[PDB]
Amino acid sequence: LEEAPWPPPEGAFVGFVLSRKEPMWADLLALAAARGGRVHRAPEPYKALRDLKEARGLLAKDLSVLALREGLGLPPGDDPMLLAYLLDPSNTTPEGVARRYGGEWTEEAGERAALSERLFANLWGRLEGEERLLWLYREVERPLSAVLAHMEATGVRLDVAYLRALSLEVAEEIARLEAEVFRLAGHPFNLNSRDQLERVLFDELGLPAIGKTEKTGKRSTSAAVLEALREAHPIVEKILQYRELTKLKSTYIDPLPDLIHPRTGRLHTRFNQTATATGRLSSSDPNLQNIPVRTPLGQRIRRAFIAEEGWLLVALDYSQIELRVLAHLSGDENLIRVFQEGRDIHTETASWMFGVPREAVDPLMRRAAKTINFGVLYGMSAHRLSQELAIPYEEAQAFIERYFQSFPKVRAWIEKTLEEGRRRGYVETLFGRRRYVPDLEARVKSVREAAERMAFNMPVQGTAADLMKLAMVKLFPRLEEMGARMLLQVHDELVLEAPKERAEAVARLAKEVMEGVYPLAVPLEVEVGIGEDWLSAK
DNA sequence: GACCACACCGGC
DNA sequence: AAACGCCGGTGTGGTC
Ligand SMILES: Nc1nc2c(ncn2[C@H]2C[C@H](O)[C@@H](COP(=O)(O)NP(=O)(O)OP(=O)(O)O)O2)c(=O)[nH]1
Ligand SMILES: [Mn+2]
Ligand SMILES: [Mn+2]
């Protein structure tokens, strides 16, 4: 490419180099653009951002987030990564996409701009005739990248002082647990080392091994194994408690306070758009899609996520979403009637599990039933189910039997999805998002059947992800008009932030947009709460 | 210091 | 651990 002076013409593709992967924290080291056989390198990258109409190129959203951080309303446009991801969701990195579609991902801005132009040309042509993937690109993924850019630059408020005080209380309890574990072991050791713990439990103590680890075949110390040994020795229960507290302290309580941005005073995640095999987003740096909620301590951590003063959080979450999606995809009349009657399969499975009336099912029980309902749907074995519920093997076998007997067209849909996946080489969502599963033809049964579980899960999980994305695209402009903020997406949930006096109107509107995103054979019901913290809004 | 595999476990 | 699926973060033990 011929070198030309900054600025570039309108519509040029950008390349850029960040001091680090996280756009909210990175220095903009270099900026360049390419168009019409020329490359334009910016002498002063920061000031040079003001010359761009949009961020068009590889990782476009990252540059848009950095621009918004600096007060510049630079939206992301075309991104070859999104094209590649729609053609094959194993296209997750610029390194791989470049090698695959005609370039090399380097560390120079000008070459990255030239690469973005070359890759877009080639990838755009590969989507000729792919009407459904083209619709997903233009109507979902490309506009969604702008929504996510704004969400990333906005962040969420965190009660730092609260978490600092919580850390000290948890530290004292961890001390009580480890000191007890060492007394029971007869000697201290590194309780964070699963190798050392393995030797204590199975060699020094006389506990029987239950399972082995995957890659190295060590005697497992997993929670599932410890639960099986809960009654064999009093050290086991303490280890499980130590694990819970240290997991939450090391992963949330201690690190999150240190990630508050100095200018915004809020916590900023990255919403990765080309990271999963199914079409889901992921969240990283930090991951805000796995904040605790299940245990008492976890709920205390979730309470640290708060609204700006004078505002409230609004949390919306699709009801039984993948089961509703399954009803539409499979057309099972029995499953459709379930939701047309307003029933709750999680609460009903819970009622059976704990032998109590539906009105007596608490959230803890219902959450456990959610795990059972989807575990069985996507292929959980009777053996594992019998151990999860502490019931005889024959009773777990009977539950799985009635589960599918209740919804006969589900098995039919699974078989048809797998047969089509073998012929075409891929499975697809309701909107045509595809995942290639070559191991459906594997000649090793264990491999083939693992691929089968991956394969018929994807249309269900992926359709739910398609629906959530489309709802975000529809909802975002309405929230801007209302002066509200979209903060987080957690797969089938949105967390919004609204002025207190508008919180109710925002909650009603967001609920209606999400429930009407795309009418199916069953209604899509959305549960909504409002509160000053994330837990309260649930 | 960065990076890695591994086992593991937080969420949906 | 076991024939649930999809993620990202941690400490250990180890290399470089
Ligand atoms: N395979 C699998 N999928 C899961 C699991 N947990 C969640 N998912 C998938 C399937 C779930 O549909 C989806 C969203 O998870 P939620 O919002 O926590 N539960 P839901 O929407 O079902 O019920 P309600 O909102 O009324 O409580 O994530 C699991 O253990 N396994
Ligand atoms: Mn839900
Ligand atoms: Mn949810």
User: CATH number, domain at A162?
Assistant: 1.20.1060.10
The burial of A140, by beta-carbon neighbours within 10 Å (0-12 exposed, 13-18 middle, 19 or more buried), is given as buried
Same domain, A14 and A107: yes
Q: Point out the domain boundary residue: A103, A121, A153.
A: A153
CB A373 within 8 A of CB A345: yes
Same domain, A254 and A113: no
Same domain, A460 and A372: yes
Cα–Cα dist A284/A392, whole Å: 41
Q: A350 alpha carbon to ligand 3 midpoint, in Å?
A: 17
Cα–Cα dist A112/A288, whole Å: 30
Q: Which residues of A in 261-290 have their CB below 7 Å from strand C's atoms?
A: 272, 275-278, 280, 282-287, 289-290
Question: How many Å apart are A152 CA and C15 C1'?
Answer: 36
Same domain, A455 and A424: yes
Distances in whole angstroms, Cα of residue A503 to Cα of each of A327, A515, A526: 33, 18, 16
Same domain, A445 and A494: no
CB A367 within 8 A of CB A354: no
Same domain, A189 and A256: yes
Q: Could you identify the residue whose CA is nearest to the C1' atom of nucleotide C11?
A: A192
Cα–Cα dist A292/A269, whole Å: 16
Same domain, A171 and A50: no
Amino acid letter, residue A65: V
Same domain, A11 and A149: yes
3-state secondary structure of A5: coil
Question: How many Å apart are A290 CA and B12 C1'?
Answer: 8
Q: Maximum CA pair distance of chain A? A: 76
For the record, the structure tokens of A309 come out as: 């003063």
Same domain, A25 and A144: yes
Closest of A429, A463, A470, A516 to residue A142, by C-alpha: A470
Closest of A527, A528, A522, A529 to residue A323, by C-alpha: A522
Amino acid letter, residue A286: P
Q: A77 alpha carbon to ligand 3 midpoint, in Å?
A: 29
Quote the crossing angle between the two packed helices A393-406 and A363-377, to the nearest 10°.
Answer: 80
Same domain, A362 and A490: no
DSSP A354-409: HT--GGG--HHHHHHHHHHHHHHHTT--HHHHHHHHT--HHHHHHHHHHHHHHSHH
Nucleotide nearest to A275 (CA to C1'): C7
Pocket of ligand 1 (CB under 6 A): A 317-322, 346, 370-371, 374, 378, 491-492
Q: Point out the domain boundary residue: A433, A464, A495.
A: A464
- Total number of domains in chain A: 4
Nucleotide nearest to A380 (CA to C1'): C4
Question: How many Å apart are A248 CA and B9 C1'?
Answer: 10
Nearest CA owner, ligand 1 atom 26: A319
CATH number of the domain at A520, please. 3.30.70.370
Closest of A375, A425, A423, A419 to residue A400, by C-alpha: A375
Nucleotide nearest to A212 (CA to C1'): C1
Same domain, A20 and A97: yes
Same domain, A399 and A499: no
Question: A7: cis peptide before it, omega within 30°?
Answer: yes
Quote the crossing angle between the two packed helices A142-154 and A445-482, to the nearest 10°.
Answer: 70
The DSSP code for A203 is I
CATH number of the domain at A62, please. 3.30.420.10
Question: How many Å apart are A415 CA and C14 C1'?
Answer: 45
Q: Could you identify the residue whose CA is nearest to the C1' atom of nucleotide C1?
A: A211
* A127: containing domain: 1-153
Please name the method used to determine this structure.
Answer: X-ray
CB A64 within 8 A of CB A149: yes
Q: Strand C: which nucleotides have any atom within 7 A of a protein Cβ?
A: 1-13
Cα–Cα dist A294/A18, whole Å: 37
Q: Point out the domain boundary residue: A448, A464, A480.
A: A464
Amino acid letter, residue A413: W
Nearest ligand 1 atom, CA A493: 17
Strand partners, A311: A499
Distances in whole angstroms, Cα of residue A431 to Cα of each of A82, A382, A387: 16, 33, 38
DSSP A400-468: HHHHHHHSHHHHHHHHHHHHHHHHHSEEE-TT--EEE-GGGG-SSHHHHHHHHHHHHHHHHHHHHHHHH
For the record, the structure tokens of A66 come out as: 């950095």
Nearest CA owner, ligand 1 atom 25: A319
